[PDB]
Point group: C9
Chain length 86, copies 9
């Protein structure tokens, strides 16, 4: 008739999922930008020895992107396999 | 007009979609500004390093913008193909 | 009492506000950070001025793209709400 | 009697409007502070050639303040000419 | 006591007003601290530049505080003269 | 069931929390940033100490003004709620 | 039977209290980290004269922690002595 | 199943608890990263200052982590011993 | 209609989302800031490399601890909700 329990649960899941991905993008965009800031400046300062900067950059971006995609996976769980759905 | 389940689900979807895109823009705006800060500073320090520095700059911006547009895709999923709609 | 669109529209306005609120945080801070580098760059090399304009405009262009794309979707949310009944 | 549709829409509009102006002030306060940080430091470093810093500062503040006031305009739309009001 | 439309509108106004002032303080506190960071650093670097540096400092703080107090004015509008009150 | 003031008071407490939450973010980070400059300034010039106190106190004064003005309005929101029925 | 007024007020109080402490920890963690960043760097640069850094550090941390604990006190008021409870 | 007061109180507690821990992690992650930035930079600048620099680093991390775990304690209070439960 | 657990579970999912949203903000920015120092440190002293690994890993370890402890409590919130009726 009117509302049912899953309408409220699903609304909660979509808001929760949004928080997860919203936070993920804040962390990833700013974290990657900060890492890349050092890469750009390091290459500017030391063009001949820049190769040694790339594994540290990719380790850093790897960590940052792992947070983004682990969050993405839990957003997908929230909205496609909602825990507590009735 | 009686409330119905999709009214609540759609309200949650729009809020969730807003969180996704709001966070996306925070990460992209600040991440791109931080990347650009190093680009601008590097060119100011060494004029002829301009070509050299656009390469790590675009790698960084690529990473930052990937977050923005993956978030955009999921906002679109939330509001145009809402998971859990009844 | 209430009707379905009252709830949907309330959600759209909150969603729209999140979109624009986040857009201004990203654009204001991103542009400030870009301009910080422009100002410092010019102070360091008073006639580096000319060569700094292109990277400043590219950076601001990217930052402003996020603001404007968000603005467009806020407009969609509140003027053509997806899911309106 | 009890609630009416516009009570809920208007509550949404006020919360939305608050998000718009809250975010606008975060972006403007921090963005202007960051721009002014460079202005202060530049004037400290180069008092004789500081005049060339002011158009770049005002362009930057112009961009930052434009975000604040465009947001202000949409807050005013949300709360004084609410889209979707019944 | 039955709920009434203004109860919901006023709740939205208070939340909206809180967002406005919460964001205002984030922008003002951090923006002023960032401006002051350059002032303090500049005086440490060159003692007799103190007078010189307060001028761009107060221009910056003026901009930052304008955001805070314009936000304050609209919080006051929201909670004392609520747009849309029935 | 419910009554009008239950909803208004719930909104006031959420609004009050936003005010103080934002106030502490601004004050904690703003003060930390001001103190960062004070500490670095003293480390650079160990007897610049005296001349740094005034600009530090002016900066902290401004930051703390935002915290305290927010505190006052949180108090208004929760102890004298505007719009209470 | 169903809901009562204090259920809604108490839910508001817990959310409000959460906002207070959530914001308090953001301000304290980042503020202390920023202060400590300068302490670490200052001690690195000037090991012999580092003692003069500690009162400025503790004044700064004092200010930052005061925001955290004043917020904590108001969270405690919100959730243990809720203003407006019926 | 009819709604009951504790359903609403517990929902508020979980949201409040989430705000507490969400803010705790923002402050701790960023505060610790900022502290570590000075540690790493200081060791890079002067290798044998390593021992010296861990002392102010752990003082800083102690302060930052205190915020995280005091917040954790109050999240636990909110969700396991909810103040105001009926 | 509704039942008590619909409201509790909706709160748990929102709470869980706040926990993980905040966790990723802290971890992404904290790790980026740590890596920024690692990259700059190596660029300054190309064979400082070895001695920078330990402080980098300690910093990342602390940052990641916040992410993981948050993850565990999100899991508690949504898979074993405290207060479920
Ligand atoms: C760097 O990795 C770590 N460091 C830690 C440091 C301290 C503590 Br106390 C916990 C830590 C835990 C971990 C991981 C881990 C490894 C194994 C099991 C559980 C957790 C991690 O949490 C990292 C997530 N980061 C990158 C945002 C993780 C979580 C979830 C899914 C993952 C998938 C793939 C890889 C890592 C995954
Ligand atoms: C710098 O300006 C831009 N750069 C962009 C860069 C990339 C992309 Br893809 C879009 C961009 C769009 C714009 C503007 C624009 C110009 C014309 C039409 C539409 C949009 C803008 O969005 C800027 C807002 N900023 C400052 C926060 C704008 C929006 C709304 C109202 C405005 C009023 C006055 C001035 C600008 C106004
Ligand atoms: C530095 O202290 C200040 N500077 C200001 C600067 C400008 C303005 Br306009 C107001 C200012 C107000 C104050 C304090 C104050 C002193 C006396 C009375 C009222 C307020 C303060 O607000 C500081 C909180 N900070 C540290 C987050 C405070 C509030 C509440 C409880 C406190 C308990 C103990 C100490 C300070 C306490
Ligand atoms: C915590 C950061 C660890 C980064 C990896 C450091 C160990 C590998 O270091 C790598 O050594 C190679 C040769 O062996 C070089 O060609 C690479 O430039 C360098 O990154
Ligand atoms: C984010 C994508 C938009 C980029 C548009 C401008 C691309 C500029 O591209 C860059 O131009 C420089 C000169 O300005 C050259 O020196 C560089 O080699 C080139 O990469
Ligand atoms: C994407 C483009 C963003 C531009 C931001 C608006 C400010 C325009 O900046 C203009 O740039 C010119 C280039 O020579 C300068 O000479 C002008 O003085 C300046 O007004
Ligand atoms: C992108 C934001 C500006 C363009 C908004 C989309 C077009 C506006 O759409 C119009 O808005 C009017 C009020 O302005 C309403 O009264 C009308 O019903 C509506 O058609
Ligand atoms: C800025 C780019 C995206 C803007 C999308 C806005 C779509 C607005 O769409 C408009 O909605 C109005 C009612 O609000 C109607 O009167 C118009 O017929 C309709 O075209
Ligand atoms: C993107 C930033 C563009 C800033 C404007 C640069 C072009 C104008 O530059 C201006 O030239 C004047 C004389 O012509 C000088 O008196 C000013 O100091 C200088 O700002
Ligand atoms: C934000 C407004 C509050 C400011 C109060 C203090 C004003 C200080 O004013 C400044 O004092 C300096 C010495 O301390 C002088 O050298 C400067 O010329 C003067 O501008
Ligand atoms: C707006 C004022 C903010 C002050 C913050 C509280 C710390 C007071 O700081 C005091 O400043 C004195 C000035 O000489 C120092 O000598 C004292 O050691 C110090 O305790
Ligand atoms: C600015 C924050 C501190 C001052 C709060 C405003 C005055 C407090 O007001 C009092 O609060 C009491 C609990 O403390 C309530 O029990 C009383 O009903 C109320 O009169
Ligand atoms: C800190 C500056 C602004 C504080 C505004 C607080 C106003 C509190 O006002 C007080 O409310 C109490 C009930 O809570 C009543 O008992 C008192 O009569 C009333 O004066
Ligand atoms: C605003 C910052 C004020 C910090 C306090 C400065 C005044 C006291 O300064 C203190 O003087 C002592 C001897 O008198 C020294 O032993 C301490 O190292 C020094 O901090
Ligand atoms: C946050 C607590 C976890 C810390 C675990 C590692 C502790 C490292 O401890 C440090 O090790 C250094 C060499 O690496 C020594 O030079 C320092 O004296 C010592 O403090
Ligand atoms: C708490 C530990 C966090 C580690 C982050 C994952 C990256 C591991 O980094 C590894 O460190 C090694 C140390 O010598 C390097 O030699 C390897 O090249 C590198 O892959
Ligand atoms: C820490 C996050 C990963 C571990 C999650 C806790 C264990 C999962 O728990 C299981 O989740 C399933 C879906 O994955 C549900 O279908 C099951 O009902 C539930 O038992
Ligand atoms: C990651 C460390 C904390 C994880 C806490 C997760 C507790 C999950 O607990 C599990 O919940 C499932 C239903 O969701 C049940 O099927 C299982 O019986 C139960 O053990």
């Amino acid at each position: 008739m009117e509302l049912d329990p899953n309408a409220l649960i699903t609304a909660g899941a979509l808001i929760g999922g949004g928080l997860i991905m919203g936070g993920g993008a804040i962390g990833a965009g700013i974290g990657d930008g900060i890492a890349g800031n050092a890469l750009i400046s390091g290459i500017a300062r030391q063009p001949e020895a820049q190769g040694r900067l790339f594994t540290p950059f990719f380790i850093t971006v790897g960590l940052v992107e792992a947070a983004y995609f682990i969050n993405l996976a839990f957003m997908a769980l929230f909205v496609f396999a909602t825990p507590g759905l009735q």
